[PDB]
């Protein structure tokens, strides 16, 4: 079992864009610096979702055909996607322990003024992603296909993303069966994964909703990306 | 609207 040099050359592309992303040092050195409090604590997480989206944006463009759809849809797919695709790599950061300063980001997010309606959810996500042991490859393909997802509001040509995305899961399926000849079911788990990083979007929403105008978590920067 | 998204996507 080999992946096909078109299946190659698609899985290289998306893993060279992945490794790009790299935590600033001004940021990692807030974490170890800051007061911790509520208010300092969420500061530094919105700062790291201001960082991530940008991030995000520069991954996608670089996601092999996304340049080729209608410009409308391209924003729809980034907007629709957003959400998802902090929580998954969250999910890394944790299950790699970074910025490794690790125990005190755990800390200042689990002390940021956010509910345990919306952190206990959140955390239990990272475990069970934790439990797959997921290759980079793996967190990469993933992130494309929750981006390059056909069926988000908003999207006027579907087709066009579907023929983006059906290549990313024959290629993700083929690594499955290559990597974890004794699972047979490892693909199916990270389908699961999929539909547990879905469920973030209403609690995540429901979240940004309930922060009143004069509490310090309003930021309206984070309302225009999120919704 | 998405301003930012936009200036992100279409800067270089
Ligand atoms: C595992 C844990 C140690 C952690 O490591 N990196 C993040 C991370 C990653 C990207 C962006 C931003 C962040 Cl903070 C992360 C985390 O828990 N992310 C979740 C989804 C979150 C929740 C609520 C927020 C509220 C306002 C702003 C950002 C938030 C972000």
């Given at each position: 079992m080999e992946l096909t040099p078109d299946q190659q050359t698609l899985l290289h592309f998306i893993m060279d864009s992945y490794n790009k992303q790299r935590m600033p040092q001004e940021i990692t050195n807030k974490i170890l610096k800051e007061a911790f409090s509520?208010?300092?604590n969420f500061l530094i997480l919105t700062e790291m979702a201001?960082?991530?989206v940008q991030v995000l944006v520069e991954f996608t463009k670089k996601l092999?055909?996304?340049?080729?759809?209608?410009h409308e849809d391209q924003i729809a797919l980034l907007k629709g996607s957003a959400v998802e695709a902090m929580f998954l790599r969250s999910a890394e950061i944790f299950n790699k322990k970074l910025p490794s300063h690790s125990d005190l980001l755990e800390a200042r997010i689990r002390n940021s003024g956010i509910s345990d309606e919306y952190i206990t959810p959140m955390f239990s996500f990272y475990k069970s992603i934790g439990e797959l042991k997921m290759?980079?490859?793996?967190?990469?393909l993933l992130?494309?296909?929750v981006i390059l997802?056909?069926?988000?509001?908003?999207?006027?040509?579907?087709?066009?993303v579907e023929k983006l995305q059906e290549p990313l899961l024959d290629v993700?399926?083929?690594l499955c069966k290559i990597h974890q000849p004794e699972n047979p079911?490892?693909?199916?788990?990270?389908?699961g994964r999929l539909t547990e990083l879905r469920t973030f979007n209403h609690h995540h929403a429901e979240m940004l909703m309930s922060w009143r105008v004069n509490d310090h978590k309003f930021t309206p920067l984070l309302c225009e990306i999120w919704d | 609207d998405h301003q930012l998204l936009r200036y992100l996507l279409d800067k270089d």
């Open positions: 509520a208010e300092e201001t960082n991530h092999p055909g996304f340049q080729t759809l209608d290759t980079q490859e793996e967190y990469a992130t494309a296909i997802s056909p069926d988000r509001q908003y999207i006027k040509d579907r087709e066009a993700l399926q083929k079911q490892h693909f199916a788990c990270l389908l | -």
